């Protein structure tokens, strides 16, 4: 593996503060985090743009009128421009001062920034290529006010700017030096502090709201001038109106509270439509869709990290969690679901291929320390600081058992067999290791062998060997299923915390008490010790994992860095997190061989092996044209089209050279493929299958290949392990579709015979 591994997702949605908005399409959600910007699509949540020039963690964000331009503003007053796929088109330090709000036109000509005591409006650049040192042009600026500008509103004429100010007043701005009605007349009389104003989309009602709950209505009579029309006085509501947004339907109001509840109103009626509670944590900001069908509102960082989507006919579209700093991760045996462990004592399941927050379990009394799956796909065991461990199955959602029984307040490491018979846990403050049969919770023994705190534990796929790393310079090996016990080695060096097993039972990886990470086998032949963990903005060794093909391990400490290594000596690639104020605490490796994970305090995973890179595996260009020679082998010689266009690796060719060959030709092809061109096409089918609707077509392929070379992948293991997992998830996720509905037309014909 050599591929360009880079961030194109993140681990759970909103940790931090910011604005929030939709696209004009109604199908794309714009919900930032503090550090980057994560724009989901509403159906099948995915990840589109990933800027990083933000040195400070706050955003202000909006798109113009079709989503071709996105900005994001942090505290300092520099902004960054992207078009559609994070080109990072333009970059622009804009201000030495912070910004409160940013607003486009519905026309894409003008541009709106509120800062300091001024108001900036800019001429918008179109989409082009680059070639501007300074792309933004100043149109006008307006002086002046008395203090800060906190909210901003645009009108439909693109001539008419309604803006509030911090000094309990509002003002009006004609854009094109018109002096619309020859008046920029102030709005006063407000007893309390102003949180927002809105201009209605019929040019006759000018709208203001205050922090107390008061709402003031002015008319377009400019006897002659402004007169009040409807007043209020609220003294018993007794909170503060935190945020406010107005409908493009021009009938409805939305009001957010610090108290933790959600208000809806009507504009000239002042009827109470609905209010909804979600907690006590304050509402930060709220924005409505362009058609009033969907509502979304964001919640503040110290309070809920939760953003709901409620409709006007009252049902919650998207609910979510995404809590704080994370302890542990593990991949499911199907490569789609990822467990997380949080500090507040929950266990949440994340479907991070598709951004759902699926399901939770809450029986913990305090923080969670360890999660890992069993290989059956049935059950998963959680470990806590509760003083006990417990079992879980997936959509039965029911607690099997809660093993404990000696007086204890701290467990720190949890590991189970592949056999599912016995569960072992290592006490951080007892010098002993615990086992339990999963049948009862009987206590078999207490295996007394250490002299320090036992701190990392794992099993083998041979499954007769227990690997037991304690924090006293001593690695130990155990027998559980024989009729005796064993002799346990001594390290040379440097107290260990991180243990990691090869899936063979033949190799053990340890992390020494410095940057040296070291490996040795089960006949203690120490292969490599490897160099430090760099990137200060002391050095550590916290987690380490053996990759599934048996050719790589991944090291993560707590120093803003993560390193790749192979089985020989060499440093492969060092990826790392840039931000500003631990980060990494857990890393494991996917069973799809496409990416892996790194549990960070921000929360960020993916590596994403892609195929945009020109690899030349077996002398690619002696097959001179990728087009015309392949065009010759689409007419003739379908054995040679596979070997020719397979040495080539344009993904824009493999669809056609793979599709075009006929059905009867397929067993003749699979019977005559070379054994060296096998795994990349077995991995190609396992990830091309999940996309298209060619189920019959790919299924006759996998019949031919799996029918062809069964013993060869039986003996030449540990790569077709990964590929075989990738095809098996497609097989089960299509089988449980068509067996269900084919049953649902299998009852029908005999149900006709009934009566």
């Amino acid at each position: 593996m050599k591929s360009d591994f880079k961030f194109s997702n993140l681990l759970g949605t909103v940790y931090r503060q910011g604005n929030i908005t939709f696209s004009d399409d109604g199908k794309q959600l714009l919900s930032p985090v503090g550090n980057r910007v994560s724009v989901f699509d509403l159906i099948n949540n995915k990840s589109f743009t990933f800027e990083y020039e933000h040195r400070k963690n706050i955003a202000a964000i909006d798109l113009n009128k079709q989503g071709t331009l996105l900005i994001s503003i942090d505290e300092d007053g520099r902004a960054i421009l992207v078009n559609f796929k994070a080109r990072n088109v333009l970059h622009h330090f804009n201000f030495k001062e912070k910004c409160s709000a940013v607003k486009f036109s519905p026309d894409g000509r003008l541009f709106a920034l509120a800062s300091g005591r001024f108001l900036q409006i800019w001429k918008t650049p179109d989409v082009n290529k680059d070639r501007q040192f300074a792309p933004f042009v100043r149109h006008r600026v307006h002086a002046g006010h008395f203090q800060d500008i906190t909210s901003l509103t645009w009108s439909q004429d693109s001539r008419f700017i309604l803006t509030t100010s911090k000094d309990l007043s509002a003002k009006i701005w004609s854009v094109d030096s018109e002096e619309k009605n020859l008046a920029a007349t102030t709005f006063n009389g407000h007893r309390d502090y102003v949180m927002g104003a809105f201009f209605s989309h019929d040019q006759e009602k000018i709208y203001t709201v205050s922090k107390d709950g008061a709402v003031f209505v002015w008319e377009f009579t400019k006897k002659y001038s402004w007169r009040i029309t409807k007043k209020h006085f609220f003294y018993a509501n007794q909170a503060k109106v935190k945020c406010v947004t107005f409908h493009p339907a021009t009938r409805l109001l939305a009001v957010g509270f610090t108290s933790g509840e959600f208000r809806l109103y009507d504009l000239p009626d002042f009827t109470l439509i609905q209010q909804l509670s979600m907690g006590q944590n304050p509402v930060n900001t709220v924005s409505v869709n362009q058609t009033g069908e969907w509502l979304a509102f964001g919640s503040s960082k110290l309070g809920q990290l939760l953003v709901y989507e409620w409709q006007s006919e009252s049902y919650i579209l998207k609910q979510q969690g995404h809590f704080d700093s994370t302890n542990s991760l593990a991949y499911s045996p199907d490569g789609s679901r990822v467990v997380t462990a949080s500090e507040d004592g929950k266990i949440k399941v994340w479907d991070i291929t598709s951004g759902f927050c699926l399901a939770t379990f809450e029986e913990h009394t305090s923080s969670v320390t360890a999660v890992q799956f069993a290989k059956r796909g049935q059950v998963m065991f959680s470990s806590s600081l509760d003083g006990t461990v417990r079992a879980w199955d997936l959509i039965r959602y029911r607690n099997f058992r809660t093993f404990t029984g000696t007086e204890r307040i701290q467990f720190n490491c949890l590991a189970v067999d592949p056999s599912g018979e016995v569960v072992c846990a290592g006490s951080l403050d007892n010098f002993d290791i615990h086992v339990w049969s999963v049948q009862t919770g009987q206590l078999l023994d207490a295996l007394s062998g250490h002299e320090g705190p036992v701190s990392c534990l794992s099993f083998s796929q041979e499954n007769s060997v227990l690997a037991s790393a304690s924090w006293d310079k001593t690695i130990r090996i155990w027998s559980i299923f024989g009729r005796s016990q064993q002799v346990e080695p001594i390290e040379v060096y440097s107290d260990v915390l991180a243990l990691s097993m090869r899936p063979d039972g033949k190799e053990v990886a340890v992390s020494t008490l410095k940057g040296q990470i070291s490996i040795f086998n089960i006949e203690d032949a120490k292969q490599v010790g490897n160099i430090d963990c760099r990137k200060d903005i002391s050095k550590f060794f916290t987690t380490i994992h053996y990759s599934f093909d048996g050719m790589a391990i991944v090291a993560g400490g707590n120093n803003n860095s993560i390193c790749l290594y192979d089985v020989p000596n060499e440093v492969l690639l060092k990826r790392f997190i840039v931000s500003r104020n631990v980060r990494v605490t857990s890393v494991q490796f996917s069973p799809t061989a496409n990416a892996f994970a790194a549990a960070s305090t921000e929360g960020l995973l993916i590596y994403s092996t892609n195929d945009t890179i020109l690899f030349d595996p077996f002398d690619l260009d002696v097959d001179v044209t990728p087009h015309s020679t392949v065009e010759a082998l689409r007419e003739k010689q379908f054995l040679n089209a596979l070997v020719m266009a397979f040495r080539l690796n344009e993904e824009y060719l493999i669809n056609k050279v793979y599709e075009a060959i006929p059905i009867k030709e397929i067993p003749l092809v699979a019977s005559n493929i070379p054994a060296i061109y096998l795994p990349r096409i077995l991995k190609f089918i396992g990830d091309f299958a999940i996309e298209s609707q060619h189920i019959e077509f790919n299924l006759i392929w996998i019949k031919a290949l799996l029918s062809a070379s069964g013993g060869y992948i039986n003996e030449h293991k540990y790569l077709f392990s990964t590929a075989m997992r990738s095809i098996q998830r497609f097989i089960v996720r299509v089988a449980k579709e068509v067996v269900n509905t084919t049953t649902d037309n299998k009852y029908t014909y005999r149900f006709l015979v009934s009566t």
Binding site: D432, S448, H450, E451
Partner: protein, 184 residues
């Protein structure tokens, strides 16, 4: 809960110490026979603390009075040393009758709860090997002041007659050094 007992002598046992160590081995599922290749290692504290065991038994021989038994509870550290009556030639028995997992009834005669009570706890805390708690045999601890006697008998009923069965060796010990241990 039930203890883990280790038995150990000097590097040079004869037959008379061998068969004696074979009888003292017969207090299992937790009694194990073991010699040292040095005389007594000073690393036995790391041996028991690392192994997690609770109790230790040492057989040796001195010339202040003749031959000596030693019992110690390991983590706290009380240690009773006792003197024996006869070490000359016992019965060559390593297992006969039942197994030693059978928890017998335990008999103390001549109740002295003034200052021998710490002894009477330890003999309770030693002979609880096994999950049985139901009597098949019996072991007798006879005080005669500072002379105690040890017996092993099996229930032999005959026409509902409570007849004893003498089996094993017959001991008679005296309180030798008992070092004042700690809460540590």
């Amino acid at each position: 809960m039930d203890p883990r007992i280790i038995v150990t002598t000097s590097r040079d046992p004869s037959t008379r110490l061998s068969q004696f160590a074979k009888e003292i081995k017969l207090l299992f599922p937790n009694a194990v026979r073991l010699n040292r290749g040095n005389y007594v290692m000073p690393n036995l504290v790391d041996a028991c603390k690392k192994s997690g065991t609770t109790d230790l038994v040492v057989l040796h021989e001195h010339r202040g009075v003749p031959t000596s038994l030693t019992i110690s509870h390991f983590p706290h550290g009380p240690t009773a040393q006792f003197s024996l009556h006869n070490v000359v030639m016992r019965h060559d028995i390593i297992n006969a009758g039942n197994q030693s997992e059978v928890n017998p009834h335990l008999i103390f005669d001549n109740f002295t709860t003034a200052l021998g009570k710490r002894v009477v706890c330890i003999l309770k805390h030693l002979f609880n090997a096994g999950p049985k708690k139901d009597s098949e045999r019996v072991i007798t601890f006879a005080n005669r002041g500072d002379f105690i006697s040890v017996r092993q008998h099996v229930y032999v009923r005959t026409r509902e007659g409570v007849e004893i069965a003498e089996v094993g060796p017959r001991f008679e010990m005296r309180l030798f050094e008992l070092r004042l241990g700690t809460l540590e």
